[PDB]
Structure 1
Amino acid sequence: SFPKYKPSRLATLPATLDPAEYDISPETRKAQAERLAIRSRLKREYLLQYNDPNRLGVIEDPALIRWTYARSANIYPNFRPTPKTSLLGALFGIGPLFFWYYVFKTDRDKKEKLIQEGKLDQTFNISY
């Protein structure tokens, strides 16, 4: 009836436009109940320490520790040299260097050749 909205990576699909939430099953209801139970258990565990009058300091969060560890220390032990890894490493670690080397070498060779011929307009060029 109306023009259709299509989602993208940086502009996602709205919940009210999602087909999965319009055709539901008792299995889906059970899964939602389990999700809410997990969230409620975590919320109770946090709130018990949050309201503790004898608690002074920082309530340690295992999820934050897991996130930082995964982002920092768990990366190399889970690395394998593969065609994708090797190709991406070679590209993004070597290509820019040679690209910039070619650019700068060409520019400086042109400038040097111009200077040898004596046509660069270096008047008032005292500081370098």
Structure 2
Amino acid sequence: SFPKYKPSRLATLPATLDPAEYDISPETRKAQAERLAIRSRLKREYLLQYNDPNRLGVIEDPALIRWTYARSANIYPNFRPTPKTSLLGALFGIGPLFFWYYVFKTDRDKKEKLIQEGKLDQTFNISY
């Protein structure tokens, strides 16, 4: 018939095809109750500040401020020099720098080798 739609990181599995979505059960039944209950309170006080006549300001989002700290300042306070970070740091650090060193130096000596006896043509190459 038709095998399946296999999900991936960029091709996620839809809720319609989700098996656990169709596997409703009492213990997860009350678990989805507070999902909206938490949402309901977050929509209540937001709207209260949203439509306050004297509200002349910006309604600060604590989640937004938390996201800014987590992605800007908190990385080092909770950083740990574990071995994995060292390979990742070395591979993405001095790795490409030395890789481009091999590429650039090889051409530079190859180009210098060629010109020093005059194989490369500079009949009109003056604007160096």
TM-score band, normalised by shorter chain: over 0.9
**1:5 Cα deviation (Å)?**
1.0
**Aligned pairs (5 A) from 1:13-28:** 13-28=13-28
Normalising by the residue count of structure 2, what TM-score does the alignment of the two structures yield?
A: 0.97
Partner-residue secondary structure (3-state), 1:16: coil
Percent identity of paired positions between Structure 1 and Structure 2? 100
Residues of 1 paired with 2:118 and 2:38: CA distance? 79
Q: Could you say which residue in structure 1 is the equivalent of 2:120? A: 120
**1:126 Cα deviation (Å)?**
1.1
Residues of 1 paired with 2:39 and 2:75: CA distance? 29
Residues of 2 paired with 1:12 and 1:116: CA distance? 59
Q: Give the structure with the higher percent helix.
A: 1
Q: Which runs of 5+ in 2 are unaligned?
A: none
Residues of 1 paired with 2:31 and 2:37: CA distance? 10
Q: Cα deviations across residues 11-65 of structure 1 (Å, max 9, x unaligned)?
A: 1001110010111111111011111100000100100000100101111110100
Residues of 2 paired with 1:102 and 1:2: CA distance? 50
**1:86 Cα deviation (Å)?**
0.6
Residues of 2 paired with 1:125 and 1:33: CA distance? 76
**1:112 Cα deviation (Å)?**
0.5
Deviates more, 1:61-70 or 1:115-124: 115-124
Question: What is the alpha-carbon root mean square deviation over aligned residues?
Answer: 0.9
Q: Cα deviations across residues 75-109 of structure 1 (Å, max 9, x unaligned)?
A: 00111111100111011101100010111100010
Spell out structure 1 runs of 4+ moving beyond 2 A.
Answer: none
Instruction: Say how many residue pairs are matched.
Output: 128
Q: Which runs of 5+ in 1 are unaligned?
A: none
